[PDB]
Amino acid sequence: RKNRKFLAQVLIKGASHITSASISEDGTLLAASTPTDVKVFHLDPLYIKKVNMTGTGLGATRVQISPDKRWICWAEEGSKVMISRVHATESADGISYTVSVPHKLHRLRRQIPKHILLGGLGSYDRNVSQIAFSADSRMLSVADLAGYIDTWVLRGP
């Protein structure tokens, strides 16, 4: 009975609903996506603060945080995958997080015929269902409902 512990309950402001979330591997970074905003919280073993996001404001459906806690990748409006670097600056009180302006990465133009793109539900099966980083975050991949898998690599300085 003492093993588990109902530790935290984070309430989101507004009226929207949490579409997705993600947490860093050490649990100090949490990110939750509504279809209006993408909110990011910093945690200290609790004590929770809200990291100020900028540049977003149209919501997302999937959110992933890198295993080295440097990349925050979401799926704005379902189909537009975006990513942002977060800069971690240590101080005398502890660590603090500044999230950069979201740098949208472009997805590959697949060859789909015009009658298929007009009929059916339209461009419905473009929205990415999974967002998966590698274990060392040198490589991103996303995947949608049509069966398309699009991957990205990291080119450093």
Binding site: G78, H115, I116, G119, G120, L121, Y124, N127
Partner: protein, 289 residues
């Protein structure tokens, strides 16, 4: 591998209020014509009481849940309707299938159109009337001019227009004389005849073009308990013209199609029949109470 079983996560279940397929039925083709219906996107939309509208894929028996679009707090979903155009043909004989648009009501005066590409609500339309309780899309006989008919609390059958990516309150066909008549279910017999159930023990049969009234079918008291007014919770229409209606007594009534009188009363349930379904060839009726 060591396992901690955990049942203390009280995930909330939410009541399903509206189930709506994309196509009600596809035309039967052979095995040599199997390649014609391969790109037809058949999806199932299920709207829960917490406002979650979530698309399923039947997948030839796979049933994969694809997208969940949640609504906000204090927001529910009551009715779901897909609007599927007929098959357009190109210049070369290729087939453009029907673009399917999803419409919903949320116990409000507003019909919402959902954008499944952007995974949010696309449009809102509302007129000066009561809260919409039931609605449906007019069936095909016109081609590009299809219209939604919506019943409501205070009575007035409002009629919305949908063409060329639009959803606007066109007009109001009629309203009942009694203000206490609440429209609870709606189903179309043909292109121009709308069958509505009401709360004051009636099944009215309006005619959409002139907005007139063909006949007022009626049902008696409920003699099982109190509350004399029977409530026709679900009407639907057979392909040969008859009308099947489940009501507050748990009955299922079969109404004649040409005369609009009842032909049969089938006492089936104990509590009230809440939803009906009719097979595409008109051979089986499913009733859920």
């Amino acid at each position: 591998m060591d396992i901690h079983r955990c049942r203390f996560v009280r995930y909330p279940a939410s009541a399903i209020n509206a189930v709506a397929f994309t196509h009600s039925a596809l035309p039967v083709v052979s095995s040599s014509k199997k390649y014609l219906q391969k790109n037809i996107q058949v999806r199932l939309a299920i709207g829960r009481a917490n406002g979650d509208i979530e698309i399923w894929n039947p997948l030839n028996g796979g049933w994969y849940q694809e997208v969940i679009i949640p609504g906000g707090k204090d927001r529910s979903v009551d009715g779901l309707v897909w609007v599927t155009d007929p098959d357009e043909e190109m210049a070369d004989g290729k087939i453009i299938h029907g673009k399917s648009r999803l419409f919903s009501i949320g116990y409000t005066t507003t019909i919402t159109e959902w954008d499944l590409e952007k995974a949010r609500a696309k449009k809102h339309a509302s007129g000066q009337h009561g809260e919409i309780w039931c609605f449906g899309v007019q069936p095909l006989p016109a081609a590009q001019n299809r219209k939604l008919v919506a019943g409501t609390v205070d009575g007035n059958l409002v009629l919305y227009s949908i063409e060329d990516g639009d959803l606007k309150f066109q007009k109001t066909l009629t309203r009942t004389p009694s203000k206490k008549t609440k429209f609870v279910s709606i189903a179309f017999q043909s292109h121009n005849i709308v069958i509505v159930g009401c709360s004051n023990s009636t099944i009215c049969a309006y005619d959409v073009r002139t907005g007139t009234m063909l006949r007022q079918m009626t049902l008696g008291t409920d003699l099982t308990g109190g509350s004399k007014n029977i409530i026709v919770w679900a009407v639907k229409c057979l392909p040969n013209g008859d009308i099947v209606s489940g009501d507050s007594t748990g009955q299922v009534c079969i109404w004649d199609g040409k005369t609009y009188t009842q032909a049969q009363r089938i006492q089936s349930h104990t509590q009230d029949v809440l939803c009906l379904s009719v097979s595409a060839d008109g051979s089986k009726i499913i009733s859920g109470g």
